[PDB]
Amino acid sequence: MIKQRTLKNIIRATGVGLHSGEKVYLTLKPAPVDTGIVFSRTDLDPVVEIPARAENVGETTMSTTLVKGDVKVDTVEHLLSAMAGLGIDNAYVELSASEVPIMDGSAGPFVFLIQSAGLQEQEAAKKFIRIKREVSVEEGDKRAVFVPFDGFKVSFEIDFDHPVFQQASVDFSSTSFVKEVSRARTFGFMRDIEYLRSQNLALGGSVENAIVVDENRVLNEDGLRYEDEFVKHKILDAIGDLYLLGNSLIGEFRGFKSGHALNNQLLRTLIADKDAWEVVTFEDARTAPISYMRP
Numbered sequence: 001m002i003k004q005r006t007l008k009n010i011i012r013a014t015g016v017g018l019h020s021g022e023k024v025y026l027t028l029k030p031a032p033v034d035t036g037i038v039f040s041r042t043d044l045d046p047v048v049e050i051p052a053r054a055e056n057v058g059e060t061t062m063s064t065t066l067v068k069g070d071v072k073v074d075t076v077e078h079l080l081s082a083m084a085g086l087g088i089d090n091a092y093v094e095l096s097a098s099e100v101p102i103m104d105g106s107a108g109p110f111v112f113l114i115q116s117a118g119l120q121e122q123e124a125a126k127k128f129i130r131i132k133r134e135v136s137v138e139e140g141d142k143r144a145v146f147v148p149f150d151g152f153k154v155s156f157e158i159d160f161d162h163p164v165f166q167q168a169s170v171d172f173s174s175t176s177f178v179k180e181v182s183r184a185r186t187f188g189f190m191r192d193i194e195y196l197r198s199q200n201l202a203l204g205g206s207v208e209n210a211i212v213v214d215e216n217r218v219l220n221e222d223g224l225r226y227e228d229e230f231v232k233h234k235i236l237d238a239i240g241d242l243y244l245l246g247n248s249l250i251g252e253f254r255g256f257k258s259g260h261a262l263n264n265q266l267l268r269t270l271i272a273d274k275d276a277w278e279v280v281t282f283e284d285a286r287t288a289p290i291s292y293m294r295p
């Protein structure tokens with residue numbers, strides 16, 4: 001079978017909250033079968049755990065935020081993108097503060113830390129959400145769509161009237177998540193960043209963790225990791241948002257100027273329309289329409 005996966009060892013990392021500027025300590029731990037990804041605020045007594053599920057999403061204005069009562073976990077989408085990309089079913093993610101650390105603004109540091117610790121296959125079948133009908137959400141000129149597809153592929157299109165400009169398609173039948181998507185960093189325009197700083201936000205922002213863009217150009221002296229790094233980052237973000245379903249996807253996702261808000265609207269509509277999806281396992285990994293790297 002395609003088996004469930006967890007971590008082989010615990011992973012400790014430290015970083016900065018993009019908006020808070022706070023140092024945050026991160027511990028990833030193995031978790032039993034059918035746990036999913038569970039975030040834990042270990043700075044609080046008692047600790048507050050929030051399963052990384054569509055139903056626990058609170059704020060989607062700037063990133064994906066999990067909420068339980070007055071307790072938040074901000075910016076889950078890069079770490080979740082890493083977990084999805086590597087096929088991690090089950091993990092406890094402990095944080096010492098309300099925001100996952102931004103690291104370099106990509107999923108690269110997370111896929112390295114996870115693969116350094118190694119994966120452990122577990123003695124249960126891996127559950128997949130299979131798209132069986134088209135599900136589309138629109139709000140104005142923004143669109144997010146799930147389409148049936150025997151595999152996992154993600155297409156995105158953004159539209160900025162801008163000089164440093166975008167569309168991209170990635171199929172996990174030939175594309176490496178790690179090599180082609182994982183390293184795509186977060187981006188922001190000077191205009192917006194100075195307004196957020198004016199609001200006492202993006203306090204952790206730096207060329208170390210974000211692509212900073214003018215009206216004309218990338219201000220980061222060391223440049224881009226990919227000619228299409230901007231749209232590849234939106235694909236990274238979308239994979240993290242889709243993983244809030246709590247299982248890997250058999251299907252296609254198409255985003256047109258989509259963001260965390262509309263992605264979460266797509267997940268809620270899909271979950272509600274039970275004719276549009278089913279939970280599948282594969283007793284024979286040879287006949288499965290997807291595959292993951294050796295553990």
Ligand SMILES: CS(=O)(=O)C[C@H](O)[C@@H](N)C(=O)N1CCC(Cc2ccc(C#Cc3ccc(CO)cc3)cc2)CC1
Nearest residue numbers: 062063077186187188193202205206207210212237259
């Ligand atoms: C708008 S979006 O791109 O769809 C949202 C995005 O993908 C989302 N997942 C995300 O990554 N994020 C949510 C929004 C956030 C916006 C952002 C905030 C701050 C900065 C910065 C900076 C900065 C860099 C260098 C200096 C020199 O002193 C000063 C400041 C850059 C971007 C970036 C992180």
Ligand SMILES: [Zn+2]
Nearest residue numbers: 077078186237
């Ligand atoms: Zn992002």
